[PDB]
Structure 1
Amino acid sequence: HMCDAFVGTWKLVSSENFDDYMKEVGVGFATRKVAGMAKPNMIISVNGDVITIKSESTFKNTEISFILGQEFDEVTADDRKVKSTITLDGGVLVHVQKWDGKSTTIKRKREDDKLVVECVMKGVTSTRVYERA
Structure 2
Amino acid sequence: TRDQNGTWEMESNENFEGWMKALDIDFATRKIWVRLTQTLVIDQDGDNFKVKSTSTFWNYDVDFTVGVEFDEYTKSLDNRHVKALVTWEGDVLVCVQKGEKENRGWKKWIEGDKLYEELTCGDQVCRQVFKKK
Question: Per the shorter chain, which TM-score range?
Answer: 0.7 to 0.9
Q: Point out where structure 1 has 5 or more consecutive residues left out of the alignment.
A: none
Amino acid at match of 1:14: S
SS in 2 for 1:37: coil
In structure 1, distance between residues paired with 2:122 and 2:39: 26
Whether the aligned pair in 2 keeps the contact of 1:64 and 1:74 (CA below 8 Å) is: no
User: Which TM-score applies when normalising by structure 2?
Assistant: 0.85
Counterparts in 2 of 1:50 and 1:18: CA distance versus 1, 3 Å: same
| Residues paired across the two proteins, number | 131
Q: Percentage identity across aligned positions? A: 34
Amino acid at match of 1:46: Q
In structure 2, distance between residues paired with 1:76 and 1:119: 17
Q: Point out where structure 2 has 5 or more consecutive residues left out of the alignment.
A: none
The answer to whether structure 1 residue 119 and structure 2 residue 119 are counterparts is yes
Whether the aligned pair in 1 keeps the contact of 2:59 and 2:76 (CA below 8 Å) is: yes
In structure 1, distance between residues paired with 2:54 and 2:24: 22
Deviates further, 94-103 or 19-28: 94-103
The answer for the alignment partner of 2:74 in structure 1 is: 75
Amino acid at match of 2:74: V
The answer for the alignment partner of 1:16 in structure 2 is: 14
Amino acid at match of 1:96: V
In structure 1, distance between residues paired with 2:22 and 2:126: 11
Whether the aligned pair in 1 keeps the contact of 2:68 and 2:86 (CA below 8 Å) is: yes
Q: CA deviation at 1:101?
A: 5.5
Map Cα deviations across residues 9-68 of structure 1 (whole Å, 9 max, x no partner).
001111111101211232221221122122121011124532111112211111111111
User: Which TM-score applies when normalising by structure 1?
Assistant: 0.85
Whether the aligned pair in 2 keeps the contact of 1:31 and 1:78 (CA below 8 Å) is: no
Q: Would you identify which runs of 4 or more consecutive aligned residues in structure 1 move more than 6 Å?
A: none
